[PDB]
Amino acid sequence: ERGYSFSLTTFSPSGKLVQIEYALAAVAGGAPSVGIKAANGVVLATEKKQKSILYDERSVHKVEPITKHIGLVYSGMGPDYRVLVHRARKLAQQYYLVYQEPIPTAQLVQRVASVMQEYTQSGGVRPFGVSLLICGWNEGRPYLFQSDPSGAYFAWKATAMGKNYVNGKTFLEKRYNEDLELEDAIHTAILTLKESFEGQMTEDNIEVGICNEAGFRRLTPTEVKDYLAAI
Template sequence: MSGIGTGYDLYPTTFSPDGRIFQVEYAHKAVENSSTAIGLCCKDGVVFGIEKIILSKMLVEGTNRRVFSVGEHIGIATAGLTADGRRIVQNARQEAKNYENFTSDIIPIHVLTERLSIYVQVFTLYNYIRPFGCSLMIGSYDEEKGPSLYCIEPDSVALGFYGCAIGKGKQEAKTEISKLKLSEMTCKDAVKEIAKILMKTVHDETKEKEMELEMSWICKETKGKHKLVPKKLIEEAVEWVKGQENEED
C-alpha cells in the first residue's frame, strides 16, 4: 500500500487521485491487525467479549484491559492500538461528566456516540495529528428502551448494531453472529456463544499461542451497570466449548 500511496499518505487531509485517504486506511489496517472483539445485543442486555493473545507467560492475568466503563451505565470495548482506545475513553468520560454537570442527568448512549464520532473525525482533519488506529463498540442497557450497541470506526462512521465484531477476525465472527437469534438470547447464553466464536472460529491455533477471554456485560442482572462477567461464568463457558469440541471429535 505504501508504494501506491507514495506522496499521498503524508497527511490525513490529502486525497489521492482516486479519492482515497491513505492515513485513514492505515488506521483501519491497525485495527485489522489487532485481536478480535465481539459485542452482542441480547434481549436483556449487551455482552462484550475480547480475544487477548498471551504473548508471554510472565504477563499477569487481567492486565492491559480493553473493556472500559463510562460512568456506571455505559461500557466500551476497543480493538486496535490500546493507547488510542484509552484516549478516546478518556474523552468519553469527560463528555459524560460535562453532560451530567449541565443537565443533572446521565448522558444517553446515542448522544455520547455522536460526540465521540465527531471527536474521532477531528483527528482526520488536520495535518499535525493522525487518525486514531482504533475501533470501539459502545453498549448500554435501559429498562424502558432496552439494550443498545454502537460501533465507531477510525473514519468516524458510527452505526448501531444487534451484533458486531471488530479486529482481525471480524469477518468470520460476523458470519457466526448472523446465525444467532439475538432477540431470543439471554446474556448468559451470549457469554457461551462469544466464547465459542472466539475460541473455535476466530482464534488461530496454528500460532500456538494461548489466549485469554475478557468479557463484560451490562444487563438486568447487573441492574443496568457495566461490570466484568464473573470469572466462574467465563470458566463454565470455556468448559462448555471444550465439551462441544470433544463431542465433535
C-alpha cells in the first residue's frame, strides 16, 4: 500500500473549491433526469440510451431501490453510483437494526451527504461525480431531495438534472404547478424527458420509478409502454 493521506481538494485564490465545480461540470454532462413530487407520491424519470442494439437493457438498472419505500435515481457517472447505493443500503440497514423502524428519507439524505462530504475532505481521493435524487413516502407526506457532489442537499417540489437542465427547470416551473396528481405528474415527466430525447421513446429508452403510500415500485416495461403511447 501507499497511504497518501493528503487532501488534494484545496481552496482557490478566488475563494472556492475548484474540484467541486469540476465535479458539477461532470454532472452537467451526464444523463438527463427529472423528479416530480405531486401531492400523493414522487415520480422519478431518466433516459437510457444505448450505443447499439446489441446491449441488454434489462441487465443494468438506474432506478435502484433502497428500502421498501425509498427510491433513488442519479445523473453523472455510473461507476461512482453503485458505491453510494451500496453505502446507503448498508446505512439504512444499520438504522433499521438500531431503531426498529423504516428509515425516514431525510436522515438517509443527510447521511449520504455526510459520506460525500468526507470523501471530498479526506486524503488522496477525488470527489464524487454524481448528483442524486432521493424519493420516498414516509409518514404520509412525500419527500424528494437532491444531493450534489459538494456534499450538501436541497429539497425540491420538482427538479431536473443532467444535460439541458435549465430549460427543463423552466419547463417544470411553467407547465407544472403546486398541485397535481400522480398520473399527470408521470405525463409531464415523460413530456419533459421528451423535450430532449431522441426521435423514438419506448420503454427500452426511458425508465420511470414511482413512489406512493403502498411502497416504492419500479415500473414494468408494459406500464411504461402504454403510458408512452399518446403522451
